[PDB]
Amino acid sequence: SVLTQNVLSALEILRLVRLDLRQLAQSVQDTIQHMRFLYLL
Amino acid sequence: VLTQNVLSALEILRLVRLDLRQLAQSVQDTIQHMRFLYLL
Amino acid sequence: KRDEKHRHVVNVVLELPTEISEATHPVLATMLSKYTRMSSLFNDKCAFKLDLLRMVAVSRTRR
Amino acid sequence: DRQPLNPANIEARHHGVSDVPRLGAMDADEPLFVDDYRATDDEWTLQKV
Amino acid sequence: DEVARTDEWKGAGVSRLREVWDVQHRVRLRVLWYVNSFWRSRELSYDDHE
Amino acid sequence: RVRKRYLRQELRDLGHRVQTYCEDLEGRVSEAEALLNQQCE
Numbered sequence: 495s496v497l498t499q500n501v502l503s504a505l506e507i508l509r510l511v512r513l514d515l516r517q518l519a520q521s522v523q524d525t526i527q528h529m530r531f532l533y534l535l
Numbered sequence: 536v537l538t539q540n541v542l543s544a545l546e547i548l549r550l551v552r553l554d555l556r557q558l559a560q561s562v563q564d565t566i567q568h569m570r571f572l573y574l575l
Numbered sequence: 576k577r578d579e580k581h582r583h584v585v586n587v588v589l590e591l592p593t594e595i596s597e598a599t600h601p602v603l604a605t606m607l608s609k610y611t612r613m614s615s616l617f618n619d620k621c622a623f624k625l626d627l628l629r630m631v632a633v634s635r636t637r638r
Numbered sequence: 639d640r641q642p643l644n645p646a647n648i649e650a651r652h653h654g655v656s657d658v659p660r661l662g663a664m665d666a667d668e669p670l671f672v673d674d675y676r677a678t679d680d681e682w683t684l685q686k687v
Numbered sequence: 688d689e690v691a692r693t694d695e696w697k698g699a700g701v702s703r704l705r706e707v708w709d710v711q712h713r714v715r716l717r718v719l720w721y722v723n724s725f726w727r728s729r730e731l732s733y734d735d736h737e
Numbered sequence: 738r739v740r741k742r743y744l745r746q747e748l749r750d751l752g753h754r755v756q757t758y759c760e761d762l763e764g765r766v767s768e769a770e771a772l773l774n775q776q777c778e
Binding site for chain 2: 741744745748749751752755756759762763766767770773
């Protein structure tokens with residue numbers, strides 16, 4: 495007691511990368527509407 | 536099924552890296568433009 | 576389209592004479608790439624004029 | 639203008655590329671654009687002299 | 688023996704110091720956050736609806 | 738004036754978090770590509 499295999503494990507993390515991209519887009523939109531709702535007169 | 540050519544992924548890295556440079560620079564430029572024009 | 580706004584920024588705002596065209600001034604096109612990205616600051620055209628001037632100056636520095 | 643200048647209101651100018659809004663803000667007062675240089679005490683004394 | 692709250696208060700200390708401004712942006716004042724402050728443990732909830 | 742001060746400070750607030758997000762995305766795309774092209778040994 496070779497790259498095509500590891501690229502799939504990399505894609506398994508790239509999925510979480512996509513999720514974080516979605517969360518940051520939602521954060522930016524939330525900030526924009528919040529600022530429009532409050533600060534603008 | 537066979538190993539994919541990596542030069543396409545090379546062009547992809549360059550496109551994504553350029554777009555991230557553009558993302559940072561453009562976000563900062565937009566906020567600074569708003570700061571100078573509308574926030575005085 | 577873009578021809579109306581491009582002609583706006585080059586003629587109504589910049590007041591540059593027509594005989595200086597796009598191909599005769601590459602830094603002009605490079606600046607026009609970013610000039611149209613802002614819709615305001617078109618009342619003090621002297622600011623765009625001055626930026627074009629100093630960008631032309633920057634281009635011709637041998638350093 | 640009225641208030642003391644917080645270190646956020648002071649913003650360095652860069653002469654090489656663009657700066658259209660900075661030229662547009664020329665008449666304005668509140669953002670104090672400066673060169674990215676700071677006079678040392680010796681040349682400060684020389685200026686005062 | 689028994690620990691006095693002064694001893695652990697001094698031995699735990701403080702780490703975060705921030706500047707706060709009046710709504711009109713007219714007064715600057717500092718706030719100190721002592722880690723051994725009793726309000727920490729109540730697991731209180733905080734939110735700011737728009 | 739107070740609403741404009743709030744707008745200024747809040748607009749500046751996300752300028753750094755966006756930079757951190759962009760740096761994370763840059764690191765992740767670089768790592769994924771680098772792993773795909775070659776593997777450290």
